[PDB]
Amino acid sequence: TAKVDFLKKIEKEIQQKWDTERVFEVNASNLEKQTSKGKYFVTFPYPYMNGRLHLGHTFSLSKCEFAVGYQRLKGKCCLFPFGLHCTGMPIKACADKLKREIELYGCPPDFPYQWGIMKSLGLSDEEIVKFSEAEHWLDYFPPLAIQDLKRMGLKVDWRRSFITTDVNPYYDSFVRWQFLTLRERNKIKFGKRYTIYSPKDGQPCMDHDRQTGEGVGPQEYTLLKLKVLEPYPSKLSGLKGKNIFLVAATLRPETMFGQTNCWVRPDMKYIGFETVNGDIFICTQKAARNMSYQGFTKDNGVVPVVKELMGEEILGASLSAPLTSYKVIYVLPMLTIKEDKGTGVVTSVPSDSPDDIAALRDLKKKQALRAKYGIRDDMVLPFEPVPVIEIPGFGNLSAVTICDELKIQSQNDREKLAEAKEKIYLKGFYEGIMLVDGFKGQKVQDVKKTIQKKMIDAGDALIYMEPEKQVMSRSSDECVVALCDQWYLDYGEENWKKQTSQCLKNLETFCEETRRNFEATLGWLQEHACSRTYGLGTHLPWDEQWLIESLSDSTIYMAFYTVAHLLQGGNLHGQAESPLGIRPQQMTKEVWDYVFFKEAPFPKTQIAKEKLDQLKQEFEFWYPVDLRVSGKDLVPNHLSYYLYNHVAMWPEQSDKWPTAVRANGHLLLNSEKMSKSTGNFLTLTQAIDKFSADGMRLALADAGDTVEDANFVEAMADAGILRLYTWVEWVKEMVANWDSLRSGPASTFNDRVFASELNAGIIKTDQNYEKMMFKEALKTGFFEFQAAKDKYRELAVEGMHRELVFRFIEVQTLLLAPFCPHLCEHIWTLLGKPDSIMNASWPVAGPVNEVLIHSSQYLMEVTHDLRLRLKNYPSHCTIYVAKNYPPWQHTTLSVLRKHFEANNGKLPDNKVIASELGSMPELKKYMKKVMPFVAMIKENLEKMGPRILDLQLEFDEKAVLMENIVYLTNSLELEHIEVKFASEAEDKIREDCCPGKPLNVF
């Protein structure tokens, strides 16, 4: 267990060496004169300071942190800067729940959590409360973040970090410029528009301030008024005097000629209220409150409630329903009503919505429904479905003529009502044909929008907006609002959308689906609700009631990095003396136009011209964004707005558009999800404490590198630190016993197989590092290097040669330094090599002879082969490697070799087999082991290439064992393992065994 500590000491040792050495401060005036290879720029989606950083952030980043700890050891520059989001509410949210959960209850509260994990963080109770105002959140968290990274030891120029609210006056200048530019280009606009909106927040709550439904929007429905005729039912008494209409939502309004009644759920609570113009509306409150914030009531947002009840009390009185050849229809119960979607009412469209015929039919069957709630001689019976839409497989009575053949007679078939409403679903959007007196033959799709708008002008119908599913901001469930005010951003452009689809067809998607989620969300993304009024953030330049919502003031932010060290040099809040000496007051809109837009004129400035070209040079050298990477949940929203924008201010400049991004899955701790709510979670500061960040870094590079859910498992970060500590002591020990390593040359065989393994490994390792799939590059360069170093200490019984033993620890201590820098710098220094290790390069992959490795992956095959047939039955073993080409085996290879060397990469008949393998007196009683093993050539030949046919088989098998048996006495744990030629075999294994399947009997 001291293993964890030993690392933990030298990690902070080599850190306070690195940091006092200032190793990562990549400047662009001193490292641009050196014409080296080309830059490498790695940017992270800067997390909020709404709380200590978590593994889900560390894995979301480790893909880049390693990347640069490698792409530097290939000679490329490495600007890995790091931002710090403070905009957006989510800070104003957890501590506002702190400010009112400390308000109405004692300090701390009494019950029968939100405060309790600000004290389960540990703070002596007093400190915890200064949190409820936002400004102490932002004086305290950007520290804990940067300390946990200094301690993770990440390759990050310090002087380029910051804060993103108005707190930091400098970035604010950067945000203000962006928007004065983005307003100049008629990319912003003002309007009164529908948006997901937090009642209780006072602003349209859209994307990164939600609990449910990151990618969710308004759904539109038509709403119908349903004149309720007297006799009203019992509870409606007092309101004699006003026009009352039941309100429901259908999405096939072409169908409403098919109205035959009106459905509500007898045991749902219903509300009725008066609009602004003064008539009476009965929906649920989710519906009511939704209408309200949509200007539907007198004062925007208020529900003028007049009475309450449940549908029980409603069933009965006739509803006169517009557009239907049944004007005196009634309200009937439908207990299967989705109790959230819609109004709490639905329509009765029996001829194109099967539930309804099920609904109708049951009321017609049992008198245990036929008088159920006020159901007279007329109620359900003479109502029959309405032929309005014919669909050319089945009938005008479509939704019936389908469930009267799939026989959904019972109304309790809700799975089989998943059957039903999927039937007349959308096919009935085109094949369905309107038949009414006025559209006979018209396509239901080209008249959909007309029949609906005919019903608005007739004052019979209006238009309803509802949450597609549900949201929780952090609290009160949200709503489409007719927001009477919102500055918003125009992602609905025709031009800008197309030039940006092209910014995507350029930018590199690390996979084949990520692009599909960028198409499907771009061809989906309309204009955006980008202005908050309460929370935290920066204020709009010209209308300062408005603050900027998070997901938009965080889009071009990457260029501040390029100049941050000089526009701030370390004070995140932006109050220390900015290194170059710019007054935050002296960064006019056009001196950004200068520093960023290349051709844009040198402005009349009261700062001399030195710093002006120097901050632009920084920019001009560092940009573009090479590779950014974050979780797969900022694919539809933030990374997206991050593509539009980077076009929007350089719509001309092709070069600076982000060129490559990367998204992973979420992370799992021990194969299960990571929500504090579970107990399966670790803040970065503790993963480190427990596992020696190098040890952690390990389990992350093994987290999986794919976009599908990448898992992190505690144990393997433990076994991590162990194979690490056995290494260091081995490397310690193998430099003590220098006097133990062979003189002369490195000439023996075991030597050369390890030595070509070694270089086989360095390149294998190289190929996956180039391709940033860190797990598979882990496997190649660490697991495969241990086993092959073990196994060449295994078979060098005359001593491991030192000049192979040393160039091997060089390469590994290197190969591994991107994964685990301090421990490698320790080793590299341990060797008494001079410079810090980050001043090393990519080691030279020497000359490789893979026919040597062929043998290596042949013995690992049999190593893996006989580990198997020992399960049944067990100590000794003699292994017959068959003697030679039998007169029936040589010949197979011989004749097939003949055809092959004459047929251009395609092989003959599968019954040509029979005529050729059959018609051979050489094959008179052994074709039954040439035809079952003429599939030994069409099964395992792609396995290697043109190998098992080219007769001579470039290595003696008998003897690449008889050498391995020491390691193979291990790895099979037997005692002795001899090998006979199948010359002294039982002849059931001489004249049977295929070289490549060596047979073996205990």
Ligand X SMILES: CC(C)C[C@H](N)C(=O)O
Per CB under 6 A, residues contacting ligand X are: 45-48, 85, 208, 249-252, 255, 342, 346-347, 349, 353, 550-551, 554, 630, 638
CB closer to ligand X out of 49 and 79: 49
Smallest separation (angstroms) from ligand X to the CB of 103: 28
Annotated binding-site residue? 551: yes
CB closer to ligand X out of 224 and 303: 224
Smallest separation (angstroms) from ligand X to the CB of 662: 14
CB closer to ligand X out of 54 and 187: 54
CB closer to ligand X out of 349 and 547: 349
**Residue 816: helix, strand or coil by DSSP?**
helix
Where do we find the tokens 């002596």? Answer: 124
Smallest separation (angstroms) from ligand X to the CB of 721: 28
Smallest separation (angstroms) from ligand X to the CB of 781: 30
Smallest separation (angstroms) from ligand X to the CB of 454: 17
Smallest separation (angstroms) from ligand X to the CB of 420: 10
Smallest separation (angstroms) from ligand X to the CB of 999: 58
What is the C-alpha separation between 574 and 576, in angstroms, rounded? 6
Question: Could you tell me which of 900, 902, 997 has the C-alpha nearest to residue 949?
Answer: 900
| Cβ atoms 527, 497 nearer than 8 A | no
Q: Which two tokens stand for residue 828?
A: 């590299």
Helix (H) or strand (E) holding 957, with range, is helix 957-960
Q: Which two tokens stand for residue 868?
A: 């198997």
- State the CB neighbour count (10 A cutoff) for residue 730: 15
Give CA separation, 991 vs 921, 960, 996, in Å.
Answer: 18, 22, 14
What is the C-alpha separation between 622 and 624, in angstroms, rounded? 6
What is the C-alpha separation between 1001 and 989, in angstroms, rounded? 9
Task: Compute the residue count for the chain.
Answer: 1002
CB closer to ligand X out of 48 and 296: 48
Classify residue 541 by burial, with Cβ atoms within 10 Å: 0-12, 13-18, 19+: middle
What is the C-alpha separation between 658 and 650, in angstroms, rounded? 11
CB closer to ligand X out of 152 and 349: 349
Residue nearest to ligand X (CB): 353
CB closer to ligand X out of 311 and 998: 311
Annotated binding-site residue? 121: no
DSSP string, 565-579: HHHTTT-TTS-S--T
Smallest separation (angstroms) from ligand X to the CB of 250: 4
The terminus-to-terminus CA distance of the chain in angstroms comes to: 43
Smallest separation (angstroms) from ligand X to the CB of 95: 17
Helix (H) or strand (E) holding 661, with range, is strand 660-664
Annotated binding-site residue? 353: no
CB closer to ligand X out of 219 and 605: 219
CB closer to ligand X out of 346 and 540: 346
Question: Could you tell me which of 145, 152, 149, 157 has the C-alpha nearest to residue 11?
Answer: 152
Give CA separation, 386 vs 117, 257, 267, 554, 811, in Å.
Answer: 60, 7, 28, 55, 80
CB closer to ligand X out of 168 and 347: 347
Classify residue 462 by burial, with Cβ atoms within 10 Å: 0-12, 13-18, 19+: middle
CB closer to ligand X out of 346 and 923: 346
Smallest separation (angstroms) from ligand X to the CB of 806: 44
Annotated binding-site residue? 425: no
Smallest separation (angstroms) from ligand X to the CB of 132: 22
Give phi and psi for 307, each to the nearest 5: -175, 165
Give CA separation, 447 vs 175, 435, 555, in Å.
Answer: 47, 12, 42
Q: Which two tokens stand for residue 690?
A: 């427990």
| Cβ atoms 7, 145 nearer than 8 A | no
Give phi and psi for 194, each to the nearest 5: -75, 130
CB closer to ligand X out of 219 and 659: 219
| Cβ atoms 717, 58 nearer than 8 A | no
Angle at 776 between CA 770 and CA 779, to 5 degrees: 120
CB closer to ligand X out of 91 and 840: 91
Smallest separation (angstroms) from ligand X to the CB of 697: 20
Smallest separation (angstroms) from ligand X to the CB of 294: 18
Smallest separation (angstroms) from ligand X to the CB of 356: 7
Peptide bond into 253 cis (omega under 30): no
CB closer to ligand X out of 639 and 817: 639
3-state secondary structure 731-775: HHHHHHHHHHCECCCCCCHHHHHHHHHHHHHHHHHHHHHHCCCHH
Give phi and psi for 988, each to the nearest 5: -75, -10
Annotated binding-site residue? 407: no
Q: Which two tokens stand for residue 974?
A: 């037997």
CA 498 to mean position of chain CA atoms: 25
Taking each helix axis from N to C terminus, what angle separates 141-152 and 2-21, rounded to the nearest 10 degrees?
100
Smallest separation (angstroms) from ligand X to the CB of 522: 18
Give phi and psi for 629, each to the nearest 5: -155, 135
CB closer to ligand X out of 286 and 611: 286
Give CA separation, 295 vs 271, 303, 467, 917, in Å.
Answer: 18, 11, 16, 86
Please enumerate, by residue number, every residue annotated as part of a binding site for L-leucine.
46, 48, 551, 554
* Annotated binding residues: 46, 48, 551, 554, 676
Binding residues for ATP: 676
